[PDB]
Each structure stands twice: as structure tokens, then as C-alpha cells.
């Protein structure tokens, strides 16, 4: 199976390949995620984890003669993911609540909401989590999340960049549309904090769902004559806002995307998209992961079933590649921490040395290696010292044309490249 790989040490993989709206349930059981809505870019990230491990297993210098295996899961519902979590933490398919296990670390989850639900269970025994996508600012607090690290930045940094973009231009009334979840509400809090002492005025804000009456939202934004709309939200919600914007004759706005949808592949090619105005955004620069294309051409218990054959390899390859390097780096950070915990040399590892998850953690914290010419390190908070942001613009060819840069240790924009709809 794609979801399981035998090995000497196992890494957990927490992914959400399918999407489903939250709904009442009356039985205590897992959701059949395989029958729900497939998400192509998430599957790509899922593969990126499988590729990274296989790459490391192919290596004779990183974990020499020590295989890495994984248990991976498709948790379309944060509430229903505990069986998979229980499996990672179980000591022989049992959990004993009172002890000082299956896996040595875990990669994921993708969203702050998944993370907040399960992280305490992992924190309690200093089981390391290395999230490839959870950007809630609260995870920067080591006292709350002592064994939590991540390879994407906090919302504060992304919010900073977004405010940089706004200050680069002349508009100072702003609408902040944000997802009705912890990720969205966090961005709102960060957005507010940053712009409080500044010329920028939050003129409208709303927590949004796929259920939201967007006609009323946009009526309110137009009545207030707000030109700039920040949509701080994941794929499903961003497509909700923007598809509704096209359908409800919204024009002449300046849209600003966070990196969760600035590289969306569905919206730029959409009929009518050019009419809502100009889409700007903060994006993760496309990192080339040598060997991944070939790997895809080769690759094509509950929540371990994709049900996604008859899948186009070119669709998958061209999907939104954001969070690729974060996944790639998360797996590698963990493998390096194991390598260094076992005290492996260039040639060999000691073996049948048993490694308690917490032992991995101090090596994870001290991570310091190069990976595709980037340096992988974490600061005091377990936040990443690597990765940057592009400023992009959606051009009339349906491409997110880069027009500028944000580097976290101190923004430039070539304003002439931006064509205004």
C-alpha cells in the first residue's frame, strides 16, 4: 500500500487528501475519506513525503543501513483522526495512558485545526511533530508546544509581508476575509496587531465558509467602497470567495492572497477571472526537487486508501507545488535527527539501538544541515530559519508572475510588471 512502508524506524505522516465539510455524526467511528472530494495538490504533498523517504533510503551517507518506514493517513476530518494518531503512539496496538511506540516522529499535519486537536497528545510525552503547513502563531510558544516544530513560517511573518504589499501602494481601506477556523482567526488577530499603528484601516472583516452568503458580504464591501480585499484562507474557502466574486459581478478590486492560494491552479484558468480585477499575492517560491517528476511517473486500517486511480500524471505534476520543500525538509530534519541520535558516521550506524521519540527531539531542535542549497535550521520556538516569499501577480496568461520579494531578515516590488484589470 501507498500509506505503509516497513522499515527499522517509522515516521508518521499526517495528510488530508480528501475534503469534506464538517457534519453531525452519531457513531464513534472513522470517516470513509476515500469516497469524499479528492484534492490534487494535497495528494502531491502526500507523494512528496513518500519520495523524500525513498530518497533517504537510497542514500548511503544518511542513515546508512538503517531503513525508514512510514504509517501515513488521509484525515479529511480533524475530529475523526484519532484512530490514526492512536496507531502512531500505541505501544503494541494498545495505549496505556499513564506511561512515561510505533513511530519515532510525525510529519504533519497540514492545518492549524488538525494540529490543535492532536498536538497535546503528542506534547505530553515529547513526541516530535514536524508540521509542513501549520502556520498558527500560537505554535511559537515552547511552553505550550515543546515537541512541536514546523517548516513553514508563522502567520505573523506572512501577515507582515501582506502588510508590506499594501504599504507599497496607495490604498488604505482594506477588507479582510478570513476562514472561519483557527488559521483564519489567527491571521485576523495578526493583521489587526500589525496595522493598529499605521495608515491602514481595516474597514470590513468577516469569517467565511462555503456556506457564507457572499452576495451580502460583497454588497457590504461595495457600500463601503473598499477596493482592497485580503482573503486569508485555504483552497476550499478561497475558491468559494473568488468563484462567488466572479458569479456576483464583483469588479475593480485588488485581491491579495496568502501563500495558501496565491499559486492556486484552478482560479487563474477560470472563466471570468479577469473581471474581478487584479489578484496579487504572497507565494512560496517554486523549489525544484530533482527527481520528483520521475518518481510520480512510477507511483501512478481506516484512512489509508486513496481511491484515485485513473489519475493524470501531468495534472498532478502541474498542481500547486507549494509546501513541497517544507514536506521535503520535514522528512529530512527527522532523518538527520535519527542519524545524529544513533551517532551514525558516514559509513555505518550502530543497530538495534532503541530510540525513544524524545531523543529525536533534541537533535531536531539543533538541526543544521544543507538541503538543495538551503540551510535547514529552527529557532528557539521551533519555527523555520529557511524559506522566503515571492510577491506574485496573476497575469493575462493565467500565470502567477513573480513581481517582487520578501526576505524575513530585513520589500521590493517591480510595479511596472503589474497590469491592472
Amino acid at each position: 500500500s501507498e500509506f505503509h512502508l516497513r522499515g527499522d524506524y517509522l515516521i508518521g505522516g499526517l495528510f488530508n487528501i480528501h475534503y469534506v465539510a464538517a457534519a453531525n455524526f452519531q457513531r464513534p467511528q472513522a470517516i470513509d475519506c476515500s469516497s469524499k472530494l479528492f484534492i490534487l495538490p494535497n495528494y502531491r504533498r502526500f507523494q512528496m513525503m513518500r519520495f523524500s523517504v525513498e530518497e533517504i533510503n537510497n542514500s548511503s551517507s544518511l542513515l546508512p543501513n538503517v531503513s525508514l518506514g512510514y504509517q501515513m493517513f488521509d484525515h479529511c476530518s480533524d475530529i475523526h483522526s484519532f484512530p490514526g494518531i492512536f496507531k502512531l503512539l500505541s505501544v503494541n496496538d494498545l495505549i496505556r495512558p499513564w506511561e512515561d511506540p510505533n513511530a519515532i516522529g510525525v510529519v504533519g499535519p497540514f492545518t492549524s485545526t488538525h494540529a490543535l486537536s492532536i498536538a497535546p497528545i503528542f506534547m505530553t510525552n515529547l513526541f516530535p511533530m514536524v508540521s509542513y503547513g501549520c502556520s498558527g502563531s500560537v505554535f511559537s510558544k515552547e511552553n505550550l508546544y515543546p515537541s512541536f516544530l514546523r517548516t513553514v513560517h508563522s502567520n505573523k511573518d506572512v501577515i507582515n509581508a501582506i502588510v508590506g504589499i499594501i504599504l507599497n501602494f496607495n490604498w488604505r481601506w482594506v477588507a479582510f476575509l478570513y476562514s472561519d477556523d483557527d488559521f483564519g482567526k489567527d491571521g485576523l488577530e495578526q493583521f489587526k496587531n500589525k496595522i493598529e499603528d499605521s495608515e491602514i484601516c481595516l474597514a470590513f472583516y468577516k469569517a467565511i465558509n462555503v456556506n457564507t452568503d457572499y452576495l451580502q458580504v460583497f454588497k457590504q464591501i461595495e457600500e463601503q467602497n473598499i477596493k482592497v480585499i485580503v482573503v486569508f484562507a485555504p483552497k476550499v474557502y478561497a475558491e468559494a470567495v473568488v468563484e462567488s466574486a466572479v458569479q456576483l459581478n464583483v469588479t475593480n478590486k485588488v485581491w491579495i492572497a496568502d501563500d495558501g492560494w496565491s499559486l492556486n491552479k484552478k482560479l487563474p484558468s477560470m472563466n471570468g477571472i479577469q473581471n474581478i480585477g487584479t489578484v496579487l499575492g504572497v507565494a512560496q517560491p517554486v523549489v525544484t526537487i530533482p527527481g520528483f517528476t520521475d518518481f510520480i511517473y512510477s507511483a501512478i486500517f481506516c484512512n489509508q486508501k486513496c481511491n484515485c486511480s485513473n489519475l493524470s500524471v501531468k495534472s498532478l505534476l502541474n498542481a500547486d507545488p507549494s509546501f513541497s520543500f517544507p514536506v521535503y525538509a520535514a522528512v529530512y530534519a527527522i532523518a538527520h535527527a535519527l542519524h545524529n541520535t544513533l551517532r551514525c558516521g558516514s559509513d555505518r550506524c550502530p543497530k538495534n539501538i532503541t530510540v525513544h521519540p524524545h531523543m529525536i527531539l533534541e537533535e531536531l531542535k539543533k538541526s543544521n544541515f544543507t538541503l538543495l542549497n538551503q540551510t535547514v535550521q529552527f529557532d528557539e520556538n521551533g519555527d523555520p530559519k529557511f524559506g522566503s516569499l515571492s510577491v506574485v501577480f496573476w497575469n493575462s496568461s493565467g500565470n502567477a508572475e513573480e513581481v517582487g520579494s520578501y526576505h524575513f531578515q530585513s520589500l521590493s516590488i517591480n510595479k511596472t510588471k503589474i497590469k491592472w484589470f
Partner: antibody
Amino acid sequence: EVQLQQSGPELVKPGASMKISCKASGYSFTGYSMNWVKQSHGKNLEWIGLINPYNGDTTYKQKFKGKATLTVDRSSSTAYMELLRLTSEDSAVYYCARSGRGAPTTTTAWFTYWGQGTLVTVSA
Amino acid sequence: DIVLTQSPASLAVSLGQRATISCRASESVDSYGNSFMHWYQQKPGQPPILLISRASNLESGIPARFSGSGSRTDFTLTINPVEADDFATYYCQQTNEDPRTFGGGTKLEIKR
């Protein structure tokens, strides 16, 4: 409290150039446009231009292009205005003034905070 | 450039009476559902003080005896009742178009 502290009165020779400073405290310097205003005795107020201290972008009233130069120093939270090739017609009081909060654009901002003014006398 | 003509240029109002100052714009200063006409007070030797923004918003710390009204191209500043410390030059300013422009000013004198 928000304070805009301008530099003291200046006597400058004709043909020469001089620089006026405006030191900002009590708020986030790069959050708001800094504006400059000319007042000649017999007092009309005239907008010279503004600067975005976050990125240094500038905007000038036409007649002041090549005459005034707005700059900032973020390390010290000071906005500067250099006047060039001075004539007796540049003798005036010059004000720095910060944009307020609530305007839809940087263009539409009004001036909520002013410096105390700098007298400039152009004379041999 | 939008021209602002204030009237009258000069005005004397007794203590406790009502003072009315006008500003006419050569072009509309309306945009974004607002009127970007503002009123400033300048006492002798001092920086101007913002009284009123966007045609009728009294700024914090300004007495309620000051008020503004109007839209598009016609604006009034009213002072009621006039007090002894109210002598000043009053400027209107539009910020609808670049460049910002000021009216010529109106000199308010306390009549006695």
C-alpha cells in the same frame, strides 16, 4: 504622545542648499506618510509633497520637483527635506505633517499631526 | 489643480454669537462615499490644528462648538458660540485629488 520635532531656524545664503529635519516619535515611523508644507509670510499654505517612509516613494506638487527632496532615515525615525538653489522666494516657514488614519488612500489622508515649523531665511 | 475659494476673507463675530465660514471648490472633492474637505485652525505663530475631517467629523479634543457641513463643492465651518480664544485663520483643505490644496484662509476676529 505623537511629536514631530523639526530642526531650528536657518539662515542660508542665496544659491545655497539646506536640509530640514523632522524627528518623529510616539508611533511607528513607517506606518504613515510624512508630508511637507510651505507657508510664506502673508500666509498661504502650500503642499510640497509627501514621502512613504516604509519604502521611500515620493510625490511632489509639480512646482517643487527639482526644488525639494524628501528622504527618511528609519534608523533614527527622521524625515528630511532638502531645499536646492535657494532664492528669496524660498524664505518661508516649512512644516512637516503626518498623515492621519481613516482615509481610503494615501492621497486622501488629512494632516492630524504637525511639527512646530522651521523658519528659513534666504539672505546674503 | 482644485482651487479653494474661502469666503469671506475676513470676519468679525461678537463673543457668544455664531460664526459662519464657507469654502467653494472649483471641482467636486467627493469620492469613496465621502467628501475630502477638511478644516484647520491656525493661531498666530503656531502650527495649524485639524478641526474637522471629511466635511463634518470633529477631531478628538476639539470643542463641539466647532462643526462642519456640506458636500461636493460647497462647505461650511460653523463656530457656535464664538469664544475669546477663537480668533485665528481658518483654512479649508481638499485631499480628493493630487496635489492637495488649501483655500486662502479666513481671518476670524473677535468683535467687541
